[PDB]
Design a protein around this nucleic acid. Sequence first.
RNA 1: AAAA
Lengths: 437, 435
Amino acid sequence: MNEKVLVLIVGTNPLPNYVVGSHLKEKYDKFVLIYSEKNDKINQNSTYDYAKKLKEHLNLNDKCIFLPLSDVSNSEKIINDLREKFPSEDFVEVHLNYTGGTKTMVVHIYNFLKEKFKNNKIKFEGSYLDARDYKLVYDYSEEAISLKDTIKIDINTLLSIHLYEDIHFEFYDTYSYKQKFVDSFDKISQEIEKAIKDDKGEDFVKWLEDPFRKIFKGENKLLEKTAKFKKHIEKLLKDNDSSPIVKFNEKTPQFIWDILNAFPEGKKLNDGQKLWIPDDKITNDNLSSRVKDTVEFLNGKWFEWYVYSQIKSELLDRKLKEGEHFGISLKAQKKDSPYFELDIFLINGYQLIGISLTTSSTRRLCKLKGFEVIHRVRQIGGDESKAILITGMDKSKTEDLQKDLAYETGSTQKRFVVFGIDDWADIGSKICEEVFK
Amino acid sequence: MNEKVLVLIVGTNPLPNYVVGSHLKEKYDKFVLIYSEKNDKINQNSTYDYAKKLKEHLNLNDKCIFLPLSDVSNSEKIINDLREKFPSEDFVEVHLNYTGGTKTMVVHIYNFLKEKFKKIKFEGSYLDARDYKLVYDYSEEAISLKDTIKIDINTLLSIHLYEDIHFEFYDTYSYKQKFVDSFDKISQEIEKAIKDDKGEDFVKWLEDPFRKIFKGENKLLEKTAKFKKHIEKLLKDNDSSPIVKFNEKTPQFIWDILNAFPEGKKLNDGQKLWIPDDKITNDNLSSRVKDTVEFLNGKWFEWYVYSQIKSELLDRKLKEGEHFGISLKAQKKDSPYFELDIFLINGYQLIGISLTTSSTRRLCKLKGFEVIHRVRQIGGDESKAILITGMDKSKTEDLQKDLAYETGSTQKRFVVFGIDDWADIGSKICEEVFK
RNA sequence: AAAA
Ligand SMILES: [Mn+2]
Ligand SMILES: [Mn+2]
Ligand SMILES: [Mn+2]
Ligand SMILES: [Mn+2]
């Protein structure tokens, strides 16, 4: 009969409320979720959907009371809505976490409840979740509890509370290309890994740009039709000794030939130390079978795999569980909305770390990739998420990009980190260091 | 000495504090800027730079009182700092605008001042980001600052720590010099075609055959050797040569655009593609085609969109160079520069506009991320980003919902326009920005 | 300016 209620303020960032609720739900009998109603005339959207997700993923059920506020920018209206809608039952403890919502919502909800329950029969408590030091702080009470390593969340819950659905991703055991280059993926992977370990990445990248991309990536679907491909080849042969084809046949490094010859016999782009040039007979379907997957993987997907493989090891040493706290090829969508793609995701406690990968050394493209990773992690994991971009650029460029796209939030730790070509061989350690600090 | 003090909480968004400060400045004798100190051990950065920029651009002089907080997440540390550092003079009114700062800063600065001062007039206010209203707690007023408070691009970028601001006016646009005496005729001819719903046909012709002919090796159009070899390669592919498509399948309205350039700047020799002779030096080739190609390759679209809104912004009494402009560039200290095609300021909301003739989903999406982040960096968290592309209507609606981020407003802060909007892009922007 |  001594009811204890926890009050949470539902803003546009559902994560903090989830963390606080997960930590305190066991000690409370009722939960009041104060949220915003929708009034387009005042440019105010509703946070009800967030409140619903919070109730669902925290299993509040019938203990949850939803309190709607008409205007979250007006004190008068907030106070009035409170006196009219706030639960009237007799409580012995009212706990308010005022981390979320508008500043006016926080001030007037706090003072309203402090007065309504000033009776010493009722204990009033105020809490705040600090995003900078991952701790729950109580008002007037030195008691400070770090929730950084105590509250955990899985990828599905994180995306769900942020209104994302149809979440799909891959495991190391379920990598798509492992099925496409069956019986050969492992050799292909090791050959590439050995090269990266031998500081050969920059050479591989340069070769991929020229002569590889000039040959296999010059048109929209040249590798889909034998005709166009043979034409592209014929055209290139006109440039003679400067042709990309000659460069491929005469100046391709041995380590690259080793990687190329690690592919299955029916999926190789070369016939000996020569480019395989389809004859007139080759069927368009035959061509695609032999070159599509191979070219796509070599055009970059390999880097994603390599970095993932380097990180899995270290993350297993830690408590992270694949599928829940880390994965590759993440895709999801908001209802009736276009899907997104994130190469690698990692969750440290309740912080999302998104990793985008590019083999590019060019400043312009890498810059754009940075904007992308920053926006995506914010959309799917919240405003306190970290974004990491792994590029094929040198240190000076990486440092410049970090300064270029840096945005201030009040924290001393960076939320946008850029790695470069010199970090590839030891990328796993570099990631472990940046993520787990 | 009936002194009246205004208290502001300095978060990482200085714009609302500047707006509230500019509105209430002439009513208060003292200003207490409460900001955070830096402490790496608690991952707490300092907002002192924003407080400095607020004092500078509000011209507070010695009437500004800096009040540092050591820990903006600790209620006891906040109260102790306030009790020891808040000015002790006799005030008849203490006005606290609690719009900025962390929630703990807001709660405990509000209750500390409400206890300390409230038969003395205590007042709390909050600037609504959604409806542009300064709401009072005790007087229960709600004054709209949407059309009252104005800010220029220099002040806006400076409070957000950006410096070395440069841009171009309508009458200082660069290409006007590249085509002296002829820029008008060139832009009017292009404008006439886009207003005639020829934009989609124009961009198709720019992708092929225009970019096949003039967009190859770096400096291709500045080296006769590179360019003549290139054309000779193209002529080899006679059946589908872009040179044949240029001469035989170019529509009439594009010939009128090409013929609008001066004689020494035309890509065409009569009704054919101009192929340079062997007497043509590197200087001759570059003088004829370099500026014409770069302008037709996309730069023309920046000028077109800018010219379609200039008259509509002057009708609304906005001042060029202060509230709108082209080719904005700036930077942070010792930091790389940024480039924004067009900027517009409605009241005190920044509207950044990124332009591209591209119809590709992937490239337009990357430009969407860029303009979203840039207007956030230089204009704050409540700025609007507009991306004008060449995609069809269905691709713009997808990209709009693709990059939409929920901040609590019903009005979208990321707007995407496409090829269907070019003919009336002036009205499409005016309605989106002001209505 | 709805985990500064
Ligand atoms: Mn009243
Ligand atoms: Mn599914
Ligand atoms: Mn990638
Ligand atoms: Mn542009």
